[PDB]
UniProtKB/Swiss-Prot annotation, chain B:
Record-given protein name: Photosystem I P700 chlorophyll a apoprotein A2
Subcellular location: Plastid, Chloroplast thylakoid membrane
Quaternary context: The PsaA/B heterodimer binds the P700 chlorophyll special pair and subsequent electron acceptors. PSI consists of a core antenna complex that captures photons, and an electron transfer chain that converts photonic excitation into a charge separation. The eukaryotic PSI reaction center is composed of at least 11 subunits.
Transmembrane segments: 1-27, 49-71
Described purpose of this protein according to its UniProt entry: PsaA and PsaB bind P700, the primary electron donor of photosystem I (PSI), as well as the electron acceptors A0, A1 and FX. PSI is a plastocyanin-ferredoxin oxidoreductase, converting photonic excitation into a charge separation, which transfers an electron from the donor P700 chlorophyll pair to the spectroscopically characterized acceptors A0, A1, FX, FA and FB in turn. Oxidized P700 is reduced on the lumenal side of the thylakoid membrane by plastocyanin.
Family from the record: Belongs to the PsaA/PsaB family.
From Swiss-Prot, chain E:
GN (gene name): psaB
Residues reported to bind [4Fe-4S] cluster: C45, C54
Entry function: PsaA and PsaB bind P700, the primary electron donor of photosystem I (PSI), as well as the electron acceptors A0, A1 and FX. PSI is a plastocyanin-ferredoxin oxidoreductase, converting photonic excitation into a charge separation, which transfers an electron from the donor P700 chlorophyll pair to the spectroscopically characterized acceptors A0, A1, FX, FA and FB in turn. Oxidized P700 is reduced on the lumenal side of the thylakoid membrane by plastocyanin.
This protein's name: Photosystem I P700 chlorophyll a apoprotein A2
Residue intervals passing through the bilayer: 3-21
Subcellular location: Plastid, Chloroplast thylakoid membrane
Stated family: Belongs to the PsaA/PsaB family.
Assembly: The PsaA/B heterodimer binds the P700 chlorophyll special pair and subsequent electron acceptors. PSI consists of a core antenna complex that captures photons, and an electron transfer chain that converts photonic excitation into a charge separation. The eukaryotic PSI reaction center is composed of at least 11 subunits.
Swiss-Prot record, chain G:
Top-level EC class as recorded in UniProt: oxidoreductase
Entry protein name: Photosystem I P700 chlorophyll a apoprotein A1
Sequence positions that bind chlorophyll a: M654, Y662
Cofactor note: P700 is a chlorophyll a/chlorophyll a' dimer, A0 is one or more chlorophyll a, A1 is one or both phylloquinones and FX is a shared 4Fe-4S iron-sulfur center.
Sites where the protein binds chlorophyll a': H646
Curated annotation (Swiss-Prot), chain H:
Cofactor: [4Fe-4S] cluster
Subunit composition and interactions: The eukaryotic PSI reaction center is composed of at least 11 subunits.
Membrane topology per record: Peripheral membrane protein
Name under which the protein is recorded: Photosystem I iron-sulfur center
Protein's cellular compartments: Plastid, Chloroplast thylakoid membrane
Any one GO molecular-function label of the UniProt entry: metal ion binding
Name of the gene encoding the protein in the UniProt record: psaC
Residue sites binding [4Fe-4S] cluster 1 per the record: C10, C13, C16, C57
Enzymatic reactions: reduced [plastocyanin] + hnu + oxidized [2Fe-2S]-[ferredoxin] = oxidized [plastocyanin] + reduced [2Fe-2S]-[ferredoxin]
Organism, as annotated: Pisum sativum
Enzyme class at the top of the EC tree: oxidoreductase
Residue stretches making up the 4Fe-4S ferredoxin-type domain: 1-30, 38-67
Top-level lineage group: Eukaryota
Record's function text: Apoprotein for the two 4Fe-4S centers FA and FB of photosystem I (PSI); essential for photochemical activity. FB is the terminal electron acceptor of PSI, donating electrons to ferredoxin. The C-terminus interacts with PsaA/B/D and helps assemble the protein into the PSI complex. Required for binding of PsaD and PsaE to PSI. PSI is a plastocyanin-ferredoxin oxidoreductase, converting photonic excitation into a charge separation, which transfers an electron from the donor P700 chlorophyll pair to the spectroscopically characterized acceptors A0, A1, FX, FA and FB in turn.
């Protein structure tokens, strides 16, 4: 799948809060989320309250990644809305995470790679052993 | 008075340490296979017996010692 | 952004996704003008000069409390020599300043301070930070503090107002 | 008792507000921490609380054991 | 008077031993957490799943016994 | 509305709050301070001077007439059993 | 779970049983139908009123048959008020003690005896009737709830008409209620009590109804009643001033407020609530739309404001419950501090045992209700807050700068804590090192509360100057040189304020601010937080969200009420302590023939309450001697409950310092022993839930702690007063 | 960061994924069960370690196990 990319989009109406980005964004990382609304609706917005959704591309910048998903998972419910978020970084860069595969993680997809799958089954783990590793490899 | 009270608290904490390095032995250094069906490995296979009777003995002592006291008051 | 806003609480510098807001306390010309001035602020000025202002002011301020509420309030012998105490504090306070300055190195990638004003002018750097800059500033504080201390004692060790 | 009754999630959320504060306070912005301010861990608090509990336990009785006995002899 | 207190102490011993051996015999795991062996002597917990798993490590069982030890002494 | 990957700074609270002031300077009296505050500007050297300045505390306590270090005199209590 | 079908379903674990009671009254979790809920709670209030009505019936009944009220009436100064008697079983009869009047019973502190004398009640016959009348009402109230849930339940539209409800409640209940009681006073209370103060004896008093029928008996005293036409219709009103006055102060013979004033009070209160009753809009035109007026207020700072409030407070019970609990609790507190300073009952102030227990009881009830406001406010945020349908904007912003409010309130508590408790640690250290000059004391560096001392000063010089009609002061704590002494006891006296009084007030400032902090933090961050962006989806009452993020224990709004619950205890617990010592040390005592007054502890408050050691010795250790030496006497029960509370208290620490993971594993070993002997219950035993263990913990902590002082205080004042 | 593992005792009910708020897990084609899916833990870097996934697992004891390891800003759940 090819990541779509985000360039410029308008931000939803809100007026400000004290739960926004703070320094971490400047020096480590900050996460942005994009979704399209068929109507200028009203959504809760985590770390604050009441913001108008807007109609169009809709671009929002948040922190922790998790804040974006919470909004996104609420965005998929209530309103039938598709969404995507990325990790901006401080020096440009384009890291796109979620959906990623382009199909939701909960929905099985054809070529993902297992990563950290144990075909032993739990309870068959060993006991140390002063060697490196913990046995739940 | 000081010396007795001193050593009893020292003896106290030490006992909790002997009972603390016990579990650590089981988790970090215990080899179940090398200790197959020996006196040590037999403690884990009837552990519910030792614990329950300690519960009973504790519940017994508490129910009456406290009972006899409150009664007297 | 003036002046039919008819409301106060403009989102911080127009950004409503950065935490903080604009309030008279945050941004009032009187406050802003006030904040812009002072040794801590006033970037583009020698750090040593700024420390002196700050250092000198604090040292002078510290004497009053120590002398008045000291263990010898209350004594000719400790008539104000306790100011010595105020001085000791600035000796200690200069250590804390010095050790903190070691969190900034001499490489030093000078300045962790922002590189732009609001209005996003995009111009200039600060320099208070960095090893050389911070050290000068402490030295100023030490100098400023010890002095402020002596002077305040001076007037008191004469006084007449108010006895 | 504070570290034993009150638990972490309350304190962590409290510190997060204090982290915001320090950042938005003039004349204090110039100074920054080198270590991220976080609430004590779940196990750490149980320890720290137990240490307080044990120290006060000993010191109180120590103060009483000596004085009450020393006073009368 | 010496009768009741000796039973109180006997109560203190049994209960403290109950807490300590239970932490030892269940250090490698129980039915609420069969793979406790894989987490070490000291870990915060295993989460609120399966009803809740607060103070389930062998370390915490020690930490609970220290209270009872202080009471006994 | 205004996010620009080009400048990551304005995007964040990178900007110095208007409290910054990069204006002129202060009177020439500085020429004096710069001369006499120099030895304390070195850092590390100052760290030491202040710590060894703790030699003052030793001097101040070795010689101190009015701190309670004397009974002044009394006849001590025996006292519970002598 | 009876309330819900799936909930009722079946029991598989013991957790089902605990859940069943935990969500018994959680009406909004059983249905989403607002009308069904409202119908439920409305009937529930009836069932409540029945219980308190039955409660009243037993108080009047016991006063009639099991009390020495008549005996106390003739000799109120040294007869001990006692209701309820104990059957002579397994050695119980020792709790029946000498209370005077040739009667054996437990001395009481409810204060009903003082209430009954004020009402002009004279015989058990009268108490007997009032008990029955209460039972008759209890039968009604219970029946009324059954009728309004199964026969004729009101529409949701009925409950929503708040305007009509407001007009009535502060006029139909308050106004006429005050007016009706105002009538009983001048017709029954005032005439009969006037006799009682003349030492006429109750049986020699004519019956109340004889005062009403013929004016003759009521007119010889208070001769304004003589005119049949009455000067009321003449609208001069100056003539009436004999039975009602603005005298204030305190009657030097009965030690209570002049009923001569309380009647006038209610007369004013009544119509003041009758006029204010004519405010909101209904059907016949004249009135206000509270919806309209609320909308009008807006501001440069608030933008739209209050718009939408009317919608919120007409569709959400928890919103209304929080507001009501916040002030009903606050009202109970100001009641405690108005009844001590202005004794409204005959021979009330003289009865020290009743006053301590009255003030202390109202402080806890007031304290608890306020904490409950925090809960339902947080419940509203989790369950009823919807910006899409019911935006307010006031609520917004608050949520917008919530990290600000908490951070500041966090600082104030640290400032207060240092500048309160620290001063004591200072004094404790300076006194131990042998330097009292250094301490914060009246004898050394003093911190005089000149502001409070100034307000009191203007209250003293108020009658005549800024209060012409007032002959005497409001309360004698603002008197100046006055002193009321009923019996050989001191009813009241000007209360001084020193440096010792400066410290303790600052401790109350503290404890209240911290309690506010914990509770307010839980309400604002009930839905979202930087730590937990979706806390609202976890609900209001959940244990946590795992050990992740370093640990997220007690992030729920429920747990914030849990933590703030101990602090409300810590708070009041020191208010009542302030009350107890200050009153005993500088107010309560015996007055001699010469006029010399000796207080119970002898003015040791000023220089010994500035030290921590001073409270632990001169207050606790000293004033305990009563409770710990009450064995073999009538106050035997207090000694036991003192020990009994210390236990349920230390019993709470078992639940508070531990977690359920240990207990469940312990049960496993115990279930094994059962399965060996065929004695394993089909309903599998489970440990308490993470949240329940906290609920169990705090209840026992509050019970053992509160109960423990209860026995403290009640043993102290009875043996001494 | 935190260490998460999946076990073949899984039955592919996908509840561990829906529970995660940081998107640490995902479903994978497999031949081991009737669902023919299996959980995967590719993005452990974003794992906070809250064990929401474990409280959704229906397998007799967890098929997904979270082992709290080294702490990072992401794992610490910090927004500052
Ligand atoms: C927090 C409560 C508290 C307070 C108010 C005090 C106060 C005092 N202590 Mg104590 N002490 C305390 C707790 C406290 N102590 C505790 C808990 C202990 C246990 C160890 C002690 C042990 C102790 C000892 C052994 C001694 C004292 C002594 C003193 C006196 C002199 C100390 C001093 O250096 O002046 C203070 C120095 C300062 C630099 C004060 C600066 C603070 C200023 C006022 C802040 C102003 C804020 C301002 C509004 C900022 C914004 C302004 C804006 C407009 C710009 C002073 C009355 C001494 C004494 O009294 O001897 C007889 C003494 O020997 N204390
Ligand atoms: C006259 C007899 C009578 C009968 C046969 C019923 C029967 C019923 N009621 Mg009704 N009810 C009655 C009187 C009666 N009620 C009265 C007088 C009131 C006014 C308070 C109510 C108010 C009421 C409400 C609001 C509801 C019902 C409901 C019900 C149905 C379910 C029962 C239930 O709630 O669960 C439990 C049964 C109990 C008896 C619970 C105990 C509650 C009592 C009052 C406790 C007494 C207080 C106690 C003394 C407190 C001190 C305790 C102390 C010892 C510690 C059932 C058909 C429910 C329903 O319709 O289902 C959806 C329902 O919502 N009732
Ligand atoms: C205005 C009065 C009022 C009303 C009408 C309600 C109503 C409600 N509350 Mg609330 N509450 C109040 C005041 C009030 N509360 C105050 C003042 C506080 C602060 C302490 C609280 C704290 C609170 C919490 C934390 C919760 C509620 C909850 C609820 C809801 C259902 C819970 C339930 O069924 O009870 C269940 C009853 C029990 C479990 C009985 C417990 C045993 C008691 C506490 C022991 C009392 C000891 C006794 C007095 C002395 C010892 C006697 C013994 C030795 C024999 C229900 C809407 C729950 C909710 O989720 O809201 C929807 C919830 O969790 N309340
Ligand atoms: C609701 C509050 C309340 C409380 C806490 C009490 C408490 C008590 N009552 Mg009272 N009572 C009440 C209301 C109350 N009553 C009302 C409204 C009436 C009018 C019908 C009565 C009529 C009454 C009588 C006639 C007696 C009591 C007695 C008692 C005491 C013995 C307990 C008992 O009855 O044995 C157990 C109860 C049962 C086995 C039946 C259930 C006990 C202190 C007895 C007493 O005072 O002892 C000398 C006594 O004889 N009560
Ligand atoms: C003006 C007459 C009047 C009076 C005296 C009352 C009194 C009361 N109301 Mg009602 N109310 C009224 C008008 C009145 N209301 C009208 C016109 C409406 C329609 C909007 C309501 C709607 C309403 C609701 C929804 C509720 C009440 C409730 C209550 C009770 C709360 C307890 C209390 O306040 O303390 C003191 C209590 C007493 C002094 C008991 C009074 C004895 C009876 C009830 C008085 C009968 C009047 C009699 C003919 C004189 C109390 C009995 C609450 C309640 O408890 O539910 C049952 C409740 O939730 N009222
Ligand atoms: C409008 C002028 C007016 C005025 C100033 C009065 C004034 C008075 N009336 Mg009269 N009354 C009036 C008109 C008036 N009334 C009318 C129009 C009728 C019907 C024809 C009455 C029928 C009446 C009766 C039966 C009584 C009074 C009585 C009284 C006296 C009240 C004493 C009491 O106890 O009650 C008072 C002097 C009482 C009285 O006679 O005093 C002893 C008395 O019982 N009035
Ligand atoms: C600001 C503080 C203050 C307060 C709380 C009061 C309160 C009161 N005043 Mg005072 N008054 C004040 C300042 C104050 N006054 C000043 C500065 C003056 C000088 C101009 C007066 C002159 C004054 C007079 C002449 C009277 C009162 C009266 C009253 C009482 C009744 C008020 C009323 O009729 O309806 C609300 C009330 C207790 C009345 C009174 O004495 O009650 C018997 C009365 O007639 N006041
Ligand atoms: C005073 C407080 C207190 C009390 C009474 C207990 C009591 C007990 N603890 Mg505990 N504990 C406490 C504090 C306390 N603990 C604290 C502060 C901690 C540190 C967190 C612990 C940590 C701890 C651990 C780790 C363990 C215990 C265990 C036990 C049980 C030991 C069995 C026994 O000896 O007697 C039996 C019971 C009693 C003596 C008390 C029962 C209470 C009365 C007697 C019951 C009668 C009820 C009566 C009818 C009143 C009815 C009320 C009415 C409303 C219905 C016993 C229940 C152990 C256990 O569970 O063994 C099975 C155990 O594992 N405790
Ligand atoms: C030295 C002794 C002199 C005393 C002065 C200092 C002591 C008093 C403290 C000053 C506080 C300023 C109040 C301004 C009066 C005031 O509150 O103005 C209220 C102001 C008015 O807003 P609006 O005009 O919009 O109001 C109408 C509409 O908004 C509502 O429909 O609203 C705000 O200020 C919003 C920001 C809240 C401000 C938060 C500050 C809260 C202070 C907290 C301390 C409470 C102390 C209570 C003690 C009993
Ligand atoms: C107060 C509190 C905090 C906040 C505690 C913090 C932030 C600890 C910081 C303490 C400050 C730094 C002062 C402590 C000074 C000590 C005397 C340390 C001395 C230095 C060495 C001896 C280590 C928690 O994080 C917590 C977590 C879980 C359960 C309960 C609690 C809890 O009660
Ligand atoms: C002791 C304790 C338990 C165990 C305590 C329990 C399970 C209390 C419930 C036991 C009751 C008393 C047993 C019920 C017995 C039935 C009522 C049957 C009785 C039959 C006759 C005697 C009437 C926890 O589960 C727990 C959980 C979280 C934090 C702390 C703790 C905690 O401290």
């Amino acid at each position: 799948t090819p990541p779509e990319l985000d360039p410029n989009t308008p931000s939803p109406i809100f007026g400000g809060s004290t739960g926004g980005l703070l320094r971490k964004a400047q020096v480590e990382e900050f996460y942005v989320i994009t979704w399209e609304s068929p109507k200028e609706q009203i959504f809760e917005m985590p770390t604050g309250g009441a913001a108008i959704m807007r109609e169009g591309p809709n671009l929002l910048k948040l922190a922790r990644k998790e804040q974006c998903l919470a909004l996104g998972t609420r965005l998929r419910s209530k309103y039938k809305i598709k969404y995507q978020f990325y990790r901006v970084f401080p020096s440009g860069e384009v890291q796109y995470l979620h959906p990623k595969d382009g199909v939701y993680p909960e929905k099985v997809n054809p070529g993902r790679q297992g990563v950290g799958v144990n075909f032993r089954s739990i309870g068959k783990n060993v006991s140390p052993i002063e060697v490196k590793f913990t046995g739940k490899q | 008075a000081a010396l007795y009270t001193h050593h009893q608290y020292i003896a106290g904490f030490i006992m909790t340490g002997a009972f603390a390095h016990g579990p650590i032995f089981f988790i970090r250094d215990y080899n179940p296979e090398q200790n197959a069906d020996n006196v040590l490995a037999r403690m884990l296979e009837h552990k519910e017996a030792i614990i329950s009777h300690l519960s009973w003995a504790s519940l017994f002592l508490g129910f009456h010692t406290l009972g006899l006291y409150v009664h007297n008051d | 952004s003036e002046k039919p806003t008819y409301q106060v609480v403009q989102p911080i510098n127009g950004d409503p996704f950065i935490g903080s807001l604009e309030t008279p306390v945050t941004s009032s010309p009187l406050v802003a003008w006030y904040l812009s001035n002072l040794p801590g602020y006033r970037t583009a000025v020698n750090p040593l000069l700024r420390g002196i202002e700050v250092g000198l002011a604090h040292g002078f301020f510290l004497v009053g409390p120590f002398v008045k509420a000291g263990p010898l309030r209350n004594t000719e012998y400790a008539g104000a020599a306790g100011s010595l105490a105020a001085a000791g504090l600035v000796v200690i306070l200069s250590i804390c300043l010095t050790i903190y300055g070691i969190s900034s190195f001499n490489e030093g990638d000078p300045s962790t301070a922002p590189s732009l004003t609001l209005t996003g002018r995009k111009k200039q750097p600060d320099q208070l930070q960095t090893a050389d800059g911070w050290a000068k500033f402490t030295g100023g504080f030490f100098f400023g503090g010890i002095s402020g201390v002596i002077w305040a004692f001076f007037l008191l060790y004469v006084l007449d107002l108010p006895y | 008792f504070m570290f034993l009754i009150s638990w972490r999630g309350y304190w962590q959320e409290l510190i997060e507000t204090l982290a915001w504060a320090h950042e938005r306070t003039p004349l204090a912005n110039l100074i920054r921490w080198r270590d991220k301010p976080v609430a004590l861990s779940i196990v750490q608090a149980r320890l720290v609380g137990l240490v307080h509990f044990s120290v006060g336990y000993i010191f109180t009785y120590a103060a009483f054991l000596i004085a009450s006995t020393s006073g009368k002899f | 008077g010496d009768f009741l207190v000796h039973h109180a102490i006997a109560l203190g011993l049994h209960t403290t031993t109950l807490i300590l051996v239970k932490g030892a015999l269940d250090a490698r795991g129980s039915k609420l957490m069969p793979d406790k062996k894989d987490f070490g002597y000291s870990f915060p917990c295993d989460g609120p799943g399966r009803g809740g798993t607060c103070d389930i490590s062998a370390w915490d069982d020690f930490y609970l016994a220290v209270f009872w030890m202080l009471n006994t002494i | 509305y205004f996010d620009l990957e080009d400048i990551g700074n304005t995007t964040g609270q990178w900007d110095l709050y208007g409290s910054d002031a990069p204006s002129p300077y202060s009177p020439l009296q500085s020429k004096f301070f710069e001369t006499f505050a120099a030895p304390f500007t070195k850092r590390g050297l100052l760290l030491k001077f202040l710590i060894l300045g703790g030699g003052s505390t030793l001097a101040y306590f070795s010689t101190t007439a009015s701190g309670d270090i004397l009974p002044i005199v009394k006849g001590p209590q025996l006292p519970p059993k002598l | 779970g009876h309330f819900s079908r799936t909930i009722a379903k079946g029991p598989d674990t013991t957790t089902w049983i605990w859940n069943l009671h935990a969500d018994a009254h959680d009406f909004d979790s059983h249905t989403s139908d607002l009308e069904e809920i409202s119908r439920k709670v409305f009937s529930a209030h009836f069932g409540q009123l029945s219980i308190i009505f039955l409660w009243l019936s037993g108080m009047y009944f016991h006063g009639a048959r099991f009390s020495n009220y008549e005996a106390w009436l003739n000799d109120p100064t040294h007869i001990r008020p006692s209701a309820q008697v104990v059957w002579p079983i397994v050695g119980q009869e020792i709790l029946n003690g000498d209370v005077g009047g040739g009667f054996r019973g437990i001395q009481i502190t409810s204060g009903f005896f003082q209430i009954w004398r004020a009402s002009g009640i004279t015989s058990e016959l009268q108490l007997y009737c009032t008990a029955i009348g209460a039972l008759v009402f209890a039968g009604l109230m219970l029946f009324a709830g059954w009728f309004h849930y199964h026969k004729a339940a009101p529409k949701l539209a009925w409950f929503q008409d708040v305007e009509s409800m407001l007009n009535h409640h502060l006029a139909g209940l308050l106004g006429l209620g005050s007016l009706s009681w105002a009538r009983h006073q001048v017709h029954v209370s005032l005439p009969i009590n006037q006799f009682l103060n003349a030492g006429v004896d109750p049986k020699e008093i004519p019956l109340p109804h004889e005062f009403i029928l013929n004016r003759d008996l009521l007119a010889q005293l208070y001769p304004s009643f003589a005119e049949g036409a009455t000067p009321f219709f003449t609208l001069n009103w100056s003539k009436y001033a004999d039975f009602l006055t603005f005298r204030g102060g305190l009657d030097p013979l009965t030690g209570g407020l002049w009923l001569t004033d309380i009647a006038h009070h209610h007369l004013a209160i009544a119509i003041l609530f009758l006029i204010a009753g004519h405010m909101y809009r209904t059907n016949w035109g004249i009135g206000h739309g509270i919806k309209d007026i609320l909308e009008a207020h807006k501001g440069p700072f608030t933008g739209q404001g209050h718009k939408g409030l009317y919608e919120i407070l007409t569709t959400s019970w928890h919103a209304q419950l929080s507001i009501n609990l916040a002030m009903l609790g606050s009202l109970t507190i100001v009641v405690a501090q108005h009844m001590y300073s202005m004794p409204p009952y005959p021979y009330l102030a003289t009865d020290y045992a009743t006053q301590l227990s009255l003030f202390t009881h109202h402080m806890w009830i007031g304290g608890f209700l306020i904490v409950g406001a925090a809960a339902h406010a947080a419940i509203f945020m989790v369950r009823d807050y919807d910006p899409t349908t019911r935006y307010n904007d006031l609520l917004d912003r608050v949520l917008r700068h919530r990290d600000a409010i908490i951070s500041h309130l966090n600082w104030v508590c640290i400032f207060l804590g240092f500048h309160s408790f620290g001063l004591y640690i200072h004094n404790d250290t300076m006194s131990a090192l042998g330097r009292p000059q250094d301490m914060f004391s009246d004898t050394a560096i003093q911190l005089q509360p000149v502001f409070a001392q100034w307000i009191q000063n203007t209250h003293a010089l108020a009658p005549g100057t800024t209060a012409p009609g007032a002959t005497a002061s409001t309360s004698l704590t603002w008197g100046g040189g006055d002193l009321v002494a009923v019996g050989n006891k001191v009813a009241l006296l000007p209360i001084p304020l020193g440096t010792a009084d400066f410290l303790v007030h600052h401790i109350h400032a503290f404890t209240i601010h911290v309690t506010v902090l914990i509770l307010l933090k839980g309400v604002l961050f009930a839905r979202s937080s930087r730590l937990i962006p979706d806390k609202a989806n976890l609900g209001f009452r959940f244990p946590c969200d795992g050990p992740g993020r370093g640990g997220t224990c007690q992030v729920s709004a429920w747990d914030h009420v849990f933590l703030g619950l101990f602090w409300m205890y810590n708070s009041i617990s020191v208010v009542i302590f302030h009350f107890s010592w200050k009153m005993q040390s500088d107010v309560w005592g015996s007055i001699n023939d010469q006029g010399v007054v000796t207080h119970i502890t002898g003015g040791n408050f000023a220089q010994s309450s500035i030290t921590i050691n001073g409270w632990l010795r001169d207050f606790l250790w000293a004033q305990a001697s009563q409770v710990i030496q009450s064995y073999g006497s009538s106050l035997s029960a207090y000694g036991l409950f003192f020990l009994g509370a210390h236990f349920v208290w230390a019993f709470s620490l078992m639940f508070l310092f531990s977690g359920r993971g240990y207990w469940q594993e312990l049960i496993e070993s115990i279930v094994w022993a059962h399965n060996k002997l065929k004695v394993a219950p089909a309903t599998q035993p489970r440990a308490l839930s993470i949240v329940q263990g906290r609920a169990v913990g705090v209840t026992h902590y509050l019970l053992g702690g509160i109960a423990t002082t209860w026995a403290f205080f009640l043993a102290r004042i009875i043996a001494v007063g | 960061s935190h260490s998460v593992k999946i076990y073949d005792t899984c039955i592919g009910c996908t509840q561990c994924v829906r529970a995660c708020p940081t998107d640490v897990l995902e479903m994978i084609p497999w031949g081991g069960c009737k669902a023919k899916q299996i959980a995967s833990a590719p993005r452990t870097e974003d794992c906070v370690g809250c064990k929401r996934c474990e409280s959704a697992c229906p397998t007799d004891f967890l098929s997904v196990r979270v082992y709290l390891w080294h702490e990072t800003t992401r794992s610490m759940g910090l927004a500052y």
